[PDB]
């Protein structure tokens, strides 16, 4: 029977609440919306730890409005973690992440994310119509806007050939989309959302040459005048990026555009030489 000391004052509902696994992020009291101007991103001396070494160590960079930054490096280096931090999926222990001059930890998370389009490695399809799957990107959007995003994503024509056009039930219950179609839906959702910043985590699988090239074209489209951070797997992404950060063990070991990193003859040059295969 009778629980004592502090335990007699414990709220069980609070204990259940604390048992939840993702143990997330809170808006600071009075936080206002992010005053988004053109999407300049800055990490200043960022440190971050999931547990107990540092996952990210003194990470500093800027992405100027509309430029693309590619993160490259071995697995485990901390690339995806960087995208996660910009999304405020976790708080940082030291340093500062700003968008347009503003600490992202001091604005509402909802306003922050309303400005960020996430293109994940693989696309979640909902048991829902192709239209509502796209509208997942901005759930208040008109059918007209959904069409327009799909037109821009290069998926409109394939949708028109589905038996119910934009009404076609997709997902596991519905019509199976091709690999190309699925990725384009993610692109369309992002176009529809029309954010100022894109966090792109490239798939480590690829379709055939023709689809890869088309998909890659469509992606370049969605990013071209948006501030973009891409965890790059494709060589063409890196070649054409405005800046590349080479991450190793949480640290940016070297950085610059492609040609400048080659001419540096360091770690990125070693990678490029290895892929080249003289
Ligand atoms: N959710 C997590 N909990 C604990 N450690 C993690 C978690 N996610 C990633 N890590 C570790 O953080 C380090 C960086 O991972 P990640 O940022 O995904 O690297 P990358 O994208 O470069 O492969 C890796 O060692 C990974 O094992």
UniProtKB/Swiss-Prot annotation:
Subcellular location: Cell membrane; Mitochondrion outer membrane; Endoplasmic reticulum membrane; Golgi apparatus membrane
Record PTM text: N-glycosylated.
Effect seen on changing residue 261 to V: In MCOPCB7; hypomorphic mutation
Effect on the protein of changing residue 127 to Q: Does not affect N-glycosylation. Does not affect N-glycosylation. Does not affect trafficking from endoplasmic reticulum
Recorded superkingdom: Eukaryota
Induction and repression of expression: Up-regulated by cellular porphyrins (at protein level). Up-regulated during erythroid differentiation (at protein level). Induced by sodium arsenite in a dose-dependent manner.
Residue spans, topological domain Cytoplasmic: 9-278
Outcome reported for the amino acid change (mutating residue 30 to E): In DUH3; the protein is retained in the Golgi apparatus. Does not affect subcellular location in early melanosome and lysosome. Does not rescue the normal amyloid fibril formation and normal maturation of pigmented melanosomes
Domain ABC transporter: 41-274
Effect of mutating residue 225 to Q: Does not affect N-glycosylation. Does not affect N-glycosylation. Does not affect trafficking from endoplasmic reticulum
Tissue distribution: Widely expressed. High expression is detected in the retinal epithelium. Expressed in mature erythrocytes.
Effect of residue 79 to A: Abolishes ATP hydrolysis. Abolishes coproporphyrin III transport
Binding site for ATP: 50, 73-84
Domain remarks: Contains two independently folding units, the N-terminal transmembrane domain (residues 1-205) and the ABC-core domain (206-842) are respectively responsible for the lysosomal targeting and the ATPase activity.
Subunit structure: Homodimer.
Clinical disorder: Microphthalmia/Coloboma 7: A disorder of eye formation, ranging from small size of a single eye to complete bilateral absence of ocular tissues. Ocular abnormalities like opacities of the cornea and lens, scaring of the retina and choroid, and other abnormalities may also be present. Ocular colobomas are a set of malformations resulting from abnormal morphogenesis of the optic cup and stalk, and the fusion of the fetal fissure (optic fissure).
Family: Belongs to the ABC transporter superfamily. ABCB family. Heavy Metal importer (TC 3.A.1.210) subfamily.
Function per UniProt: ATP-dependent transporter that catalyzes the transport of a broad-spectrum of porphyrins from the cytoplasm to the extracellular space through the plasma membrane or into the vesicle lumen. May also function as an ATP-dependent importer of porphyrins from the cytoplasm into the mitochondria, in turn may participate in the de novo heme biosynthesis regulation and in the coordination of heme and iron homeostasis during phenylhydrazine stress. May also play a key role in the early steps of melanogenesis producing PMEL amyloid fibrils.
Name of the protein described by the UniProt record: ATP-binding cassette sub-family B member 6
